[PDB]
Design a protein around this nucleic acid. Structure first.
Ligand code: ZN
Ligand code: ZN
Ligand code: ZN
Length: 88
DNA sequence: AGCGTGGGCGT
DNA sequence: TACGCCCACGC
């Protein structure tokens, strides 16, 4: 079920997919294939580079649904936390 | 609050 | 293999 096993020293992680293992292993090696064209910072993952680029443009695609709240967020998890706060 | 950066997952 | 989504933890 999880045949892709990490063999790095002291690590026991295993994964269902080979790409998960490959992505995981960049945390051991420090390899960062993806670079921001704006600030030259490098990243282990293409999706994290994409949300990072938002920090330069101010793009915030996720809006609070609460009436009379104008708050919006770059990422969906920021909005999840925000909505959780409204109800609490 | 904003965001790096793992995870699991869908396509 | 690629791309990118949501979930969360930890500053
Ligand atoms: Zn490992
Ligand atoms: Zn940048
Ligand atoms: Zn709100």
């Amino acid at each position: 079920e999880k045949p892709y096993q990490c063999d790095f020293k002291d690590c026991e992680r295993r994964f269902s997919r080979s790409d998960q293992l490959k992505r995981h292993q960049r945390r051991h090696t420090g390899v960062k294939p993806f670079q921001c064209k704006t600030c030259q910072r490098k990243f282990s993952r293409s999706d994290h580079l994409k949300t990072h680029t938002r920090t330069h443009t101010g793009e915030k695609p996720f809006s609070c649904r609460w009436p009379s709240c104008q708050k919006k967020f770059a990422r969906s998890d920021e909005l999840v936390r925000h909505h959780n706060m409204h109800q609490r």
